[PDB]
Every structure is written in structure tokens, then in C-alpha cells.
Amino acid sequence: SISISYSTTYSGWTVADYLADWSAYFGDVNHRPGQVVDGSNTGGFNPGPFDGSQYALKSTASDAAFIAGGDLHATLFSNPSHTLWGKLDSIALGDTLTGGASSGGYALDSQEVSFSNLGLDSPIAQGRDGTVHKVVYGLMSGDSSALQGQIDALLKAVDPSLSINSTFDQLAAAGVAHATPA
């Protein structure tokens, strides 16, 4: 089932409130036609250049950053263009991104929260409608709505009383979350 890791700082927050705040602060990197600037708002893959086990992106305006983990593929100019697809197992949120292809991976110097065992798989044919794409492109664009909806479904699948409106501590009591040090 979904497995959540959270710094004790966030023990009393709901998942929805945490994500709404995190993404609003991360802010839209404007990865859109006319506005993509390589090395600024593309993020990167490990091993890359356009596929790998991690995709990571920091904000254009601060150190906030996320890492998507799984078996990921960006089509870039190939049909269906500008689709991220594959298998998405995890999302880690925090700040101070480090690493990259030259390091053999990415890590956050301050990981706040992670969501693992997401079990998302999106075929290339779904294009930009796939859940993997929506989750990650949403985060790139400062919008955690898609991620929230996937977490909500995973939580309900454990028990319908659990949701994105549960606190991290409630989710820990319910067996789906664990705390890390503040």
C-alpha cells in the first residue's frame, strides 16, 4: 500500500494542506511553449538525458524541489510529444536538490515528505492524459491537485476513513506513514 514518510515538523498537518502549501510555494516553473529554458526549468533525469529512474526539478525562484522515482520516460519531440510516462513509484518533496546524472542520482538535502509505493503506470499511448504525466507536470506547474487525487485513492483503498484530509499522525496510527526527524 502507499507508504508515507514525513518529518515530525508536519505531524499535525493534513496531507492536503501540506501539499497545497508546498506546491504554492514551489511555484509554477512555466514549462510551457515559448518558456522552456534548458537548465532553468527543464529539470533532469538520472541517468538521462530523457529517461531514467529519477526525474528531479528545483523551483526557478527558490531552493524548493521534488524528485519523482520509478521507471520514467519523456517523449520530448516524439509522438505523443511532451509526455512523461512510465511507472511512478515515489514523489519526494523538500528543498535543496543535490546530485544529477554525473552523481548517479538525485537527493534532497532537506526531504520533508515522501510518498512511496504509488503504483502508478501510464502507457505512452495515453499521452498527456496519463496519470504519471498529470502528477508530475502538475508539480512542475505548482499544482499538486493530481498528486493529491492519486494519494487520496490509495488511502481510501486502505480504508475509506483515510484520505488526504487525514493528518500525518493519523495516517501513522493507521499503518501507512512513518515519521523522520525534524
**Interface residue list for ligand HEM (CB under 6 A):** 31-34, 36, 38, 42-45, 50, 55, 74, 76, 82, 84, 128, 133, 136-137, 140
Give CA–CA dist 155/150, Å, rounded.
9
- Write down the least CB distance from residue 87 to ligand HEM, Å: 14
CB of 94 to ligand HEM, least distance (A): 18
Give least dist CB 3 to ligand HEM, A: 23
User: Which residue number, 76 or 173, has a Cβ lying nearer to ligand HEM?
Assistant: 76
Burial string for 44-70 (b: 16+ CB within 10 Å, else e) reads bbbeeeeebbbbbbbbeeeebbbbbbb
Specify the residue, 40 or 165, whose C-beta has the smaller distance to ligand HEM. Answer: 40
Centroid of chain to Cα 174: 23
Work out how close the CB of 14 gets to ligand HEM at its nearest, in angstroms, rounded to a whole number.
25
Nearer to ligand HEM, 52 or 94 (CB): 52
Cα–Cα distance between 7 and 3 in angstroms, integer?
A: 14
- Minimum CB separation of residue 78 from ligand HEM in Å reads 12
Q: What angle do CA 26, 110, 39 make, to 5 degrees?
A: 50
Beta strand 177-180 with 44-47 is: unpaired
- Torsion angle of the four alpha carbons 47, 139, 84, 153, in this order, in degrees rounded to the nearest 10: 110
Q: For residue 16, which of 128, 118, 131, 162 has the smallest C-alpha distance?
A: 162
Q: Which is nearer to ligand HEM, 101 or 179 (CB)?
A: 101
| Nearest residue to ligand HEM on Cβ basis | 84
Q: Which is nearer to ligand HEM, 48 or 119 (CB)?
A: 48
User: Among residues 88 and 171, whose Cβ is nearest to ligand HEM?
Assistant: 88
Q: How far is the CB of 71 from ligand HEM (least distance, A)?
A: 14
